[PDB]
Ligand binder design. Structure first.
Ligand code: NI
Length: 341
């Protein structure tokens, strides 16, 4: 049964609520982004209307084989009417096709559902600027002060320089990058670009990346592993056994692997600067964990909320414990008092 925080009151709408069968009174199902925790339950047998972005629509049709007639893509930054309710989709600065959703309720309430997001000051000059928000359904993944990490730009810089150094020292080194879902594509795209290679991957991943409207994509990726010196593998295989095995497959083309695991946050952020990061090494294999996040830091989250000044905040992540709920309400109150709303 559907939790209250996936219901938009005063409408027939839910958000990211596909794992509860037929939700009583829901006449349209919104999907914020193609991550499995959020799409859990969708398949080709789904017969209610789904509303999402164009990219999310591509993946529904091609990967989950949902039927065309039930997929309703909407343009971003465009006031649209759905079952008599004005809505807007906004870029969530998360993974490709990921959106925030504004609901303008009949009674005059305004609701923002962030989906998954990484807050940015650029959001302060969207169609959010023009009016008040009464309720915020907030991605609270890292709502605690200890969750710090760098900008995406600094991390990519670290990765690019690391990889270019290693391959210029050893032309026979291979670079590997782990993956298990969409998002974080810049990590492998940037590395392949500075090395002047295409990124090589399995057919199922190539199919997925083909759904994402990246410009010039056919120039950047390929299924021919033999022609590329940047390979993507499942995240699970990014370890000393998985990598030794894969090196064997390359038939003595390469004598060294440099691999990258893009995590979210790790406790090595409480002490170490991005510049200071070092690999785990075994023989001719090195592994870097790099903190490339597609969720708000604590400070980025605080800044957005303090800018938005909502009247009520409803968390969508870390809701399952009392300790977590309690902690989050404290920070909300602090933020409210500090900025005076
Ligand atoms: Ni997500």
């Amino acid at each position: 049964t559907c939790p209250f925080y996936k219901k938009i009151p005063g409408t027939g709408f839910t958000v990211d609520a596909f794992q509860y069968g037929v939700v009583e009174g829901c006449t349209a199902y919104f999907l914020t982004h193609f991550h499995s925790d959020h799409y859990a339950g969708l398949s080709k047998h789904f017969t209610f209307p789904v509303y999402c972005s164009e990219i999310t629509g591509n993946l529904l049709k091609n990967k989950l084989h949902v039927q065309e007639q039930y997929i309703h893509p909407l343009p971003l930054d465009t006031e649209c009417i759905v079952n008599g309710v004005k809505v807007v989709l906004l870029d969530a600065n998360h993974c490709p096709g990921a959106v925030m959703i504004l609901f303008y309720l009949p009674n005059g309430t305004v609701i923002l559902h962030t989906g998954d997001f990484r807050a940015d000051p650029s959001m302060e000059r969207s169609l959010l600027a023009d009016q008040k928000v009464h309720m915020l359904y907030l991605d609270t993944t890292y709502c605690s002060p200890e969750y710090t990490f760098p900008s995406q730009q600094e991390v990519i810089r670290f990765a690019i320089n690391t990889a270019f150094e290693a391959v210029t020292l050893n032309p026979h080194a291979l670079v590997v990058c782990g993956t298990y879902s969409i998002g974080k594509e810049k990590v492998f795209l940037a590395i392949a670009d500075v090395l002047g290679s295409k990124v090589g991957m399995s057919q199922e991943k190539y199919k997925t990346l083909q759904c994402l409207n990246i410009p010039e994509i056919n120039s950047l990726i390929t299924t021919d592993m033999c022609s590329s010196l940047v390979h993507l593998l499942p995240m699970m295989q990014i370890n000393f056994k998985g990598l030794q095995s894969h090196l064997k497959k390359c038939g003595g083309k390469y004598n060294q692997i440099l691999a990258f695991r893009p995590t979210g946050w790790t406790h090595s952020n409480k002490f170490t600067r991005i510049a200071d990061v070092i690999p785990q090494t075994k023989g001719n294999i090195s592994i870097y964990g790099i903190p490339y996040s597609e969720h708000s830091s604590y400070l980025e989250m605080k800044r957005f909320v303090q800018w938005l000044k909502p009247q009520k905040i409803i968390p969508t992540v870390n809701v399952g414990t009392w300790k977590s709920r309690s902690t989050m309400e404290k920070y909300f109150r602090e933020w409210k008092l500090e900025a005076g709303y």
